[PDB]
Design an enzyme around this catalytic site. Structure first.
Site, short mmCIF file in Angstrom:
data_model
loop_
_atom_site.label_atom_id
_atom_site.label_comp_id
_atom_site.label_asym_id
_atom_site.label_seq_id
_atom_site.Cartn_x
_atom_site.Cartn_y
_atom_site.Cartn_z
N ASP A 146 6.14 0.99 6.19
CA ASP A 146 5.34 1.37 5.03
C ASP A 146 6.19 2.22 4.11
OD1 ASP A 146 3.50 2.83 3.24
OD2 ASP A 146 1.91 1.97 4.47
N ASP A 203 0.03 -7.13 4.56
CA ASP A 203 -1.11 -6.55 3.86
C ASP A 203 -0.55 -5.75 2.68
OD1 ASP A 203 -3.51 -5.57 3.00
OD2 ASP A 203 -3.93 -4.37 4.78
N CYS A 218 -7.48 -6.16 0.88
CA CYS A 218 -8.82 -5.58 0.86
C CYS A 218 -9.30 -5.44 -0.58
CB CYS A 218 -8.82 -4.24 1.59
SG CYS A 218 -10.44 -3.43 1.67
N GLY A 266 -2.30 2.15 10.07
CA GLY A 266 -2.38 1.51 11.37
C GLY A 266 -3.72 0.88 11.70
C1 SAM Z 1 -4.25 -0.97 1.25
S1 SAM Z 1 -3.07 -0.11 2.31
C2 SAM Z 1 -3.09 -1.17 3.78
C3 SAM Z 1 -3.08 -0.36 5.07
C4 SAM Z 1 -2.87 -1.16 6.35
N1 SAM Z 1 -2.08 -2.36 6.07
C5 SAM Z 1 -4.22 -1.51 6.98
O1 SAM Z 1 -4.84 -2.52 6.65
O2 SAM Z 1 -4.72 -0.78 7.83
C6 SAM Z 1 -1.50 -0.58 1.55
C7 SAM Z 1 -0.35 0.34 1.93
O3 SAM Z 1 0.89 -0.23 1.56
C8 SAM Z 1 1.82 0.80 1.29
N2 SAM Z 1 2.78 0.37 0.26
C9 SAM Z 1 2.63 0.50 -1.10
N3 SAM Z 1 3.72 -0.02 -1.70
C10 SAM Z 1 4.57 -0.47 -0.75
C11 SAM Z 1 5.81 -1.08 -0.82
N4 SAM Z 1 6.37 -1.31 -2.00
N5 SAM Z 1 6.46 -1.44 0.34
C12 SAM Z 1 5.87 -1.20 1.56
N6 SAM Z 1 4.63 -0.59 1.63
C13 SAM Z 1 3.99 -0.23 0.49
C14 SAM Z 1 1.01 1.99 0.81
O4 SAM Z 1 1.46 3.16 1.45
C15 SAM Z 1 -0.42 1.69 1.23
O5 SAM Z 1 -0.86 2.67 2.14
#
Ligand code: SAM
Ligand code: K
Ligand code: K
Ligand code: K
Ligand code: K
Ligand code: K
Ligand code: K
Ligand code: MG
Ligand code: MG
Ligand code: MG
Ligand code: MG
Ligand code: MG
Ligand code: MG
Ligand code: MG
Ligand code: MG
Ligand code: MG
Ligand code: MG
Ligand code: MG
Ligand code: MG
Ligand code: MG
Ligand code: MG
Ligand code: MG
Ligand code: MG
Ligand code: MG
Ligand code: MG
Ligand code: MG
Ligand code: MG
Ligand code: MG
Ligand code: MG
Ligand code: MG
Ligand code: MG
Ligand code: MG
Ligand code: MG
Ligand code: MG
Ligand code: MG
Ligand code: MG
Ligand code: MG
Ligand code: MG
Ligand code: MG
Ligand code: MG
Ligand code: MG
Ligand code: MG
Ligand code: MG
Ligand code: MG
Ligand code: MG
Ligand code: MG
Ligand code: MG
Ligand code: MG
Ligand code: MG
Ligand code: MG
Ligand code: MG
Ligand code: MG
Ligand code: MG
Ligand code: MG
Ligand code: MG
Ligand code: MG
Ligand code: MG
Ligand code: MG
Ligand code: MG
Lengths: 346, 106, 246
Positions: free
Chosen positions: A167, A218, A273, A148
């Site tokens: 997510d 993201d 990121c 979040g």
């Molecule tokens: C780098 S984090 C970004 C967190 C958030 N978007 C932020 O910027 O605060 C990427 C997240 O995407 C989720 N994720 C990974 N594979 C995914 C998928 N196939 N479908 C949806 N979400 C996924 C993971 O749980 C991971 O925590």
RNA sequence: GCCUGUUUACCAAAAACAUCACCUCUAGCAUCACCAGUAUUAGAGGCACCGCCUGCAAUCACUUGUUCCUUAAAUAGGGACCUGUAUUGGCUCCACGAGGGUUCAGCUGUCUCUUACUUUUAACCAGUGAAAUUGACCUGCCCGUGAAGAGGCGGGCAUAACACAGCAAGACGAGAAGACCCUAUGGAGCUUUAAUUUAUUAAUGCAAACAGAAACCUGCAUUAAAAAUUUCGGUUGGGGCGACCUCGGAGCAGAACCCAACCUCCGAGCAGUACAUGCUAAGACUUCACCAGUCAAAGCGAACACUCAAUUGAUCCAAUAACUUGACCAACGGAACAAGUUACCCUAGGGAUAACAGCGCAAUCCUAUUCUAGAGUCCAUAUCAACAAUAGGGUUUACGACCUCGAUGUUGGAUCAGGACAUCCCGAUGGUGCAGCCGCUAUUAAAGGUUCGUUUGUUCAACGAUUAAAGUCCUACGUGAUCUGAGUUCAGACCGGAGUAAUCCAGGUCGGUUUCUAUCUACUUUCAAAUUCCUCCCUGUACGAAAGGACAAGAGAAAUAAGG
RNA sequence: GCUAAACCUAGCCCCAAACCCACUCCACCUUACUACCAGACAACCUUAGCCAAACCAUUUACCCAAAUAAAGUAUAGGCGAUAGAAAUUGAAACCUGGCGCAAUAGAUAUAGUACCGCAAGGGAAAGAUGAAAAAUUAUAACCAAGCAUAAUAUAGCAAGGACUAACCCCUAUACCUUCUGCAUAAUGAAUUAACUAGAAAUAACUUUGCAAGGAGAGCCAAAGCUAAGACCCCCGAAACCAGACGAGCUACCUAAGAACAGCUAAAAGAGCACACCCGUCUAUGUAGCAAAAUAGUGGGAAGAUUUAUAGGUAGAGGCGACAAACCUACCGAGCCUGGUGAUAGCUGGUUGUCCAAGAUAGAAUCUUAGUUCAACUUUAAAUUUGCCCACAGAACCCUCUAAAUCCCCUUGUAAAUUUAACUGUUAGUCCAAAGAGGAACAGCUCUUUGGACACUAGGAAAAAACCUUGUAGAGAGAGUAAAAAAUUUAACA
């Protein structure tokens, strides 16, 4: 039967060291002389920006932060729109310190309303929300919204009547629910305004077609900040080497699904990121070709050069990016690394 | 993972079985059987007999409580004339509450 | 012996071992169930049914004062001073059927048992016996064969002093002036007419009570019983008399 | 490898060790070592003489490719060139060596290809007289079967008894519970940033004790030193650089319950609202035991058994006046605190368990038909062949762990081979895009044959010269009580690599004990039918336009094979 | 009829009682058993470890001076395996014995001798006439294996059914142990004789005595208490510690000695080459001549050489031109004795007869080679239901709309539950069926239902798992069960 008497065994490296070696080879060529400057900022602790919670006593919090010499870069940037001459998402107040200042904000304290006064987050992560150009009455879809960092920022704007936060990992989703509960009052989350689900983002390209006007994507990626410091669940360990190899593939698929989900004439911002150009621009180009060849969908990438100049004072920008905008960390401005690209569907 | 054993949940007292007060009738994850006459339900949807008697299973009309919004929204979308049914477990009391006995002659 | 293993070879583990997991008795938490069990006072109960059974068979003569010696001599009780026994306690079992006028001295007595004896014209008094003097009282004959002077029984411990200084419990250290008031209350509570034992012919025998420092009847401490010659030796040293009389 | 010298007594004599020479480190001094010595000395080490060498990274060495010389033939030996890496470090030179490769001429039974003789042994006569071994045997062959390899079982065949001398296919032959992998809350050595300690030793500090300052001694500490004790969690994974261990839901497990993986999928190690989330008490459930876990009427007291699939940790102990609290003890039924390595290894066992082999299976491999698309100028079917289909085979690579862990190391060669025909050659016969020669293809045929060499441990292969041909296989990948021991395999060492080290290695290099007196079965002259090439003649004939160039029959010569 | 076989004493063991020996002569601490010269030389210092804790690291019983009792109590203790008092109580006491052994027994003993080892140390074997041997005319017969008397005749676990008859005919896959399953080509056994392996009474049960009391002080008692009977093996490590004994082999050192022809050369860790030392290659040998040799061929042979003699360094060590070499013919830590009957979840063995009941759910575990609990099984006891099963009844999101269960009165039947006391089994197989993993392979792996097998017999060729069939004997009676493969194919206008 397993053989345990190998002549030569690859020496065991820490996951931090493994991440550092891979980044050193790739990013030295990409950034040239700026890599040593970037590398120190990555190894140093990133500066935390204080995002004021609009639902709480935002005016009183702003006065409190001004005592700590905190300066609202968002308010300064808003006045810079006319100075240089879609705008940006309004109703966001984030306070940071001066360039080169190492002061850390005190931990947030719940207010009289029972909600946290402000949220501490990277100032470079707020830019994709601002670049999204959120407007009131829109329906916002966020992929990989948990935990979040950007999800909370959308609700602070108050421009989203319906939100779809998805997510894949339920553990990350569980963190998102607690953050929203602690910060956002229950009345907003009481209805269907905020929908938190845990499914694959690839499904959103078929289940909900053209439903949302503003989509923030993201995709997961090799987090340079987290990999070099965290030792748990690092993507650079040997067991997760397979995931890293297929990581660019998922970035193309998840972004393409989000592009199918948005309505034509809507805006989609791709956020990542990382500093690797093979996962920032190539993924963006991969999705554009994927839609045209398979589904015959055309998108246009907007120019963020105007957006770049406004935040040049409080952020460091890389001026050798083909499509997106990359914010590189610096010792004076430790925000980053962040890559965000805005594309609209036509 | 997924090495968890079964929870041994099901019918503890079948049709016609004689039960006493407090005896557990059925254990269920979801409301497969609903409490009927003189049958209580615990936190874990555990059906226990509130009175001593014989256990009976019947099919009864299901009228959800108005406060339960999810079940109310289900009957409001039914076609007119359709009626929902569910299985209810009842305990028919066997002994009376008590008897009047002569104790003295004043 | 079976096929191989520790069964046939006789190398079975110790009792209570469960093959490696924490044993059942070990995993149970400790509690003060038996803490200080060897210092707790035990009293052999004496029911009025048992007492009346002895009297009707002549094993205990009611014409003489009844103490712990007479009960043991009649095989009515079996006291084990080595087993932390401190005497006998008079219980209320069979109080309805008890009908006899006796003068019995018991270390402890219940309120109902006291009321039952006094209703029939008897006298009940409670006295303390220390473990050392307890074995002498139970088996006087073995003690007289050690050639030792009779020792004076020690006073009750600090915890038991309130019990024996109260007229309600008929303590042997209680004020005799408070006995008449306490005796009448039991008569009023249980609804029986308290007889005046003064007019009775056995009044002198009932009043016979041994000194708190005395063991037997008419045997002052310090005397040496010579059962071979049927003689008693009484020291005349002034220091010895002061030791056995204080 | 400087050299002479030294070492694994009983499998390794060396490239290993030592060695003058050089380098580094330590020490300013007396009365058992060093030493009756004193910095040109003594001790602890490294390297292995001598000679030569830059940059301030060159030159060189190592390395990747290329070529040449030698041989008839060169995975070998010798030299040169290209690429990369590496640097104090590196490169030459005498002499020498039972060190390891290459070669000239010569030499020779090492061999083509063995033969003769003497001696010992041998066999027989006489004397003396062992040892391992041995369930009982009145101890056959074939096929099949079986705990998967039968003298003993099934079905056939053979069969008077009987000793002596040979032979070594079998009796999974005999000899040391063999080597080889695995197991044990079995040992030991060694190494260390495994755990637990400083008793001991040494150096300081303080106290003590003194003089008036000090030392010795003793006590208590802190530093190291040198040692001591003990352990090396399971699960799964042949080509890796690990995952996994507790709890919950869904499929298997379709309908009461229960029901497994290497299984098929997703998670949980929380948060929130309460603050009577108080006190008590019938009767029941229970994760297949126990420990834990779950529901609960009534009653007292108040109001007018919280949500959630999981969201959890026993005892002891510590803390606390008390109430209560304490472990990713996550190896999650938890040891208060212990890691590697062993090919120097040891013991107890295991065919529950690996490799080789046998056996199962036929994914892979292999072969023939079916189909007729497609190549073959035209033309499916002279040949060749796609998608597939239908059967057979048990030669490779795999899979299974059933037999063997109380003496088969494996590979290859030598010796001698038996057998299959899916035929490399000789023979017979159809078709042909067969004129004739050559060829191709198919049916039939296992009587006979199927070479010698260079490098290579080779099998194979490369090319050298030939041949009518230099077949595919099986047989305990035939044969090792017949032989060989070259490669791999035990102890030594070196190069390269991994590791703090011990030590390790699917690599390269050098060396490295191969026992046996035949008890039993079988066998010990198949009494004797031979194949092939070349030349010649037919014949320069048939054929052909020529170029070319045959049949069959006969002769001669030669070679091998068999028998003298 | 040979070899043999038998033959009872020697003597010993455990108690009691009582406190034991040690100068004929000579010699004997130096090289002991050596008549006879100047010395100075001194004893005293916690045991440890195995083992138990299922590892191990704190810890883990060891006469300490009165039996019994208090009492396995108070206490101690990774409060855990286990350790464990005192106050107090008070005991009789007559050496001259044996429900001990009888030559593989009892002491090792005929003797600490023979013999073995350098030493410490280890350590045997056996004798048998009679009153008389100054009766040898003697101590007659029969008895293990092994032989001899007396070699053998088709064919086969050597036998059984038989038969007139040995064989011929018919039938029959040795024993033990370990495994799901061994004729198995898996283990052990040549054979004969002798020797060689289940010790404990808490509870419960059984049978007596007495009984609200029992008992020959203590202890137990809400019918108990006292006494008896009746349940708990053998061999084997590699190791660890303590105290001794070893450098006559060997490793190095010390003392004082000895050896090295001849030739070539030069004042050489030089060359050739004897003695001598060493052991490169090959062959023989492999229980050999030899627990490392023989023959030939080799290396050194005036030196860092070889060698005799005496002495020194001893195991937590020595020594080492480092080979993990050598330290008395098995040194990654000598040997001997002691702790020690070390321990072994491992291997092997576990001795008379007969009958009866009797097999496959799991959980936990530094645990999967084990153990504990449950399930199952056994005996005894109590009690009343047990099994089979008529309707009725057990979910929806879900039509593999499954086979079928659970419940269950009748009914057929006779078991079931509870109580008491414990053992043992759980490294299973194959077939049918449903479904997983592999390849819609495997005598493959993993669950579920059922059967069979480890229980007999007949039939499928031989045959653990298929079919037939069970409750046990004799018969030279009878009726039956399962039970023997089918199949031969192309004309054509
Ligand atoms: C780098 S984090 C970004 C967190 C958030 N978007 C932020 O910027 O605060 C990427 C997240 O995407 C989720 N994720 C990974 N594979 C995914 C998928 N196939 N479908 C949806 N979400 C996924 C993971 O749980 C991971 O925590
Ligand atoms: K030598
Ligand atoms: K040499
Ligand atoms: K043979
Ligand atoms: K564990
Ligand atoms: K053998
Ligand atoms: K085990
Ligand atoms: Mg499950
Ligand atoms: Mg056994
Ligand atoms: Mg040399
Ligand atoms: Mg020289
Ligand atoms: Mg040697
Ligand atoms: Mg040699
Ligand atoms: Mg060297
Ligand atoms: Mg030499
Ligand atoms: Mg030559
Ligand atoms: Mg002879
Ligand atoms: Mg012999
Ligand atoms: Mg024969
Ligand atoms: Mg056969
Ligand atoms: Mg046969
Ligand atoms: Mg013969
Ligand atoms: Mg021979
Ligand atoms: Mg184990
Ligand atoms: Mg110890
Ligand atoms: Mg249960
Ligand atoms: Mg566990
Ligand atoms: Mg559990
Ligand atoms: Mg080696
Ligand atoms: Mg043919
Ligand atoms: Mg072979
Ligand atoms: Mg061979
Ligand atoms: Mg052979
Ligand atoms: Mg070799
Ligand atoms: Mg070699
Ligand atoms: Mg010839
Ligand atoms: Mg003299
Ligand atoms: Mg003299
Ligand atoms: Mg132990
Ligand atoms: Mg151990
Ligand atoms: Mg004897
Ligand atoms: Mg005989
Ligand atoms: Mg026969
Ligand atoms: Mg010692
Ligand atoms: Mg010597
Ligand atoms: Mg000379
Ligand atoms: Mg010389
Ligand atoms: Mg020498
Ligand atoms: Mg050699
Ligand atoms: Mg010699
Ligand atoms: Mg010489
Ligand atoms: Mg000596
Ligand atoms: Mg030497
Ligand atoms: Mg070495
Ligand atoms: Mg070595
Ligand atoms: Mg020795
Ligand atoms: Mg033992
Ligand atoms: Mg039976
Ligand atoms: Mg454990």
């Amino acid at each position: 039967r397993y053989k345990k008497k190998w002549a030569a065994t690859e020496p065991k490296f820490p996951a931090v060291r493994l991440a550092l070696q891979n980044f050193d080879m790739t990013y030295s060529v990409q950034f040239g002389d700026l890599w040593p400057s970037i590398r120190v900022s990555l190894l140093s602790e990133q500066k935390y920006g204080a995002l004021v919670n609009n639902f709480a006593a935002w005016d009183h919090v702003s006065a409190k932060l001004e005592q700590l010499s905190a300066k609202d870069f968002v308010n300064e940037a808003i006045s810079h729109w006319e100075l240089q001459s879609w705008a940006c998402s309004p109703n966001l107040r984030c306070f940071t310190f001066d360039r080169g200042d190492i002061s850390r904000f005190p931990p947030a304290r719940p207010g009289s309303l029972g909600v946290m006064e402000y949220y501490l987050m990277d100032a470079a992560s707020l830019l994709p929300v601002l670049a999204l150009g959120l407007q009131p009455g829109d329906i916002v879809l966020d992929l990989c919204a948990a935990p979040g960092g950007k999800t909370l920022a959308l609700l602070q704007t108050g421009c989203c009547r319906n939100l779809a936060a998805n997510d894949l990992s339920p553990s990350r989703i569980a963190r998102l629910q607690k953050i929203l509960h602690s910060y956002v009052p229950e009345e907003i989350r009481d209805g269907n305004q905020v929908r938190v689900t845990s499914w694959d983002g690839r499904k959103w390209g078929e289940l909900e077609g053209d439903t949302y006007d503003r989509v923030l994507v993201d995709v997961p990626c090799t987090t340079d900040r987290h990999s070099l410091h965290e030792e748990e669940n690092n993507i650079f360990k040997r067991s997760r080497k397979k995931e890293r190899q297929i990581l660019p593939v998922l970035q193309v698929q998840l972004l393409a699904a989000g592009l199918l989900a948005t309505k034509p004439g809507g805006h989609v911002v791709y956020s990542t990121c990382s500093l690797s150009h093979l996962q920032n621009e190539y993924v963006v180009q991969g999705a554009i070709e994927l839609l045209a060849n398979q589904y015959s969908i055309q998108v246009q990438v907007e120019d963020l050069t105007h957006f770049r100049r406004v935040f040049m004072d409080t952020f460091c920008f890389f001026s050798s990016c083909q499509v997106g905008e990359l914010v590189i960390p610096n010792l004076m401005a430790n925000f980053g690394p962040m890559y965000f690209c805005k594309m609209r569907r036509l | 993972g997924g090495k968890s054993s079964g929870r041994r949940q099901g019918i503890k007292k079948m049709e016609g079985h004689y039960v006493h007060a407090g005896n557990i009738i059925a254990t269920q994850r979801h409301f497969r059987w609903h409490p009927g006459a003189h049958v209580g339900v615990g936190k874990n949807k555990c059906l226990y007999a509130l009175e001593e008697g014989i256990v009976r299973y019947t099919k009864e009309v299901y009228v959800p409580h108005p406060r339960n919004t999810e079940a109310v929204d289900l009957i409001t979308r039914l076609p007119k004339g359709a009626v929902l049914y569910k299985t209810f477990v009842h305990v028919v009391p066997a002994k009376p509450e008590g008897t009047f006995k002569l104790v003295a002659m004043l | 012996r079976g096929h191989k293993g520790e069964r046939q070879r006789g190398t079975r583990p110790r009792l209570g071992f469960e093959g490696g997991q924490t044993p059942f008795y070990i995993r149970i938490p400790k509690y003060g169930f038996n803490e200080g069990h060897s210092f707790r006072r035990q009293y052999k109960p004496l029911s009025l049914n048992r007492l009346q059974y002895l009297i009707d068979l002549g094993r205990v003569d009611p014409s003489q004062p009844i103490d712990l010696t007479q009960l043991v001599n009649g095989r009515g009780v079996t006291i084990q001073p080595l087993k932390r026994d401190y005497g006998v306690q008079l219980v209320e079992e069979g109080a309805d059927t008890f009908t006899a006028k006796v003068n019995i001295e018991v270390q402890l007595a219940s309120e109902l048992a006291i009321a039952a004896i006094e209703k029939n014209g008897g006298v009940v008094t409670t006295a303390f016996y220390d473990p050392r003097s307890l074995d002498i009282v139970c088996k006087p004959v073995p003690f007289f064969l050690r050639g030792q002077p009779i020792p004076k029984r020690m006073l009750p411990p600090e915890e038991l002093v309130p019990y024996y200084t109260d007229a309600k419990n008929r303590g042997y250290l209680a004020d005799p002036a408070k006995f008449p008031e306490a005796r009448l209350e039991l008569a009023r509570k249980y609804g029986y007419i308290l007889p005046d034992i003064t007019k009775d012919e056995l009044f002198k025998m009932l009043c016979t009570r041994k000194d708190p420092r005395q063991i037997f009847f008419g045997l002052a401490p310090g005397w040496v019983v010579n059962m071979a010659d049927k003689k008693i030796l009484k020291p005349t040293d002034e220091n010895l008399l002061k030791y056995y009389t204080s």
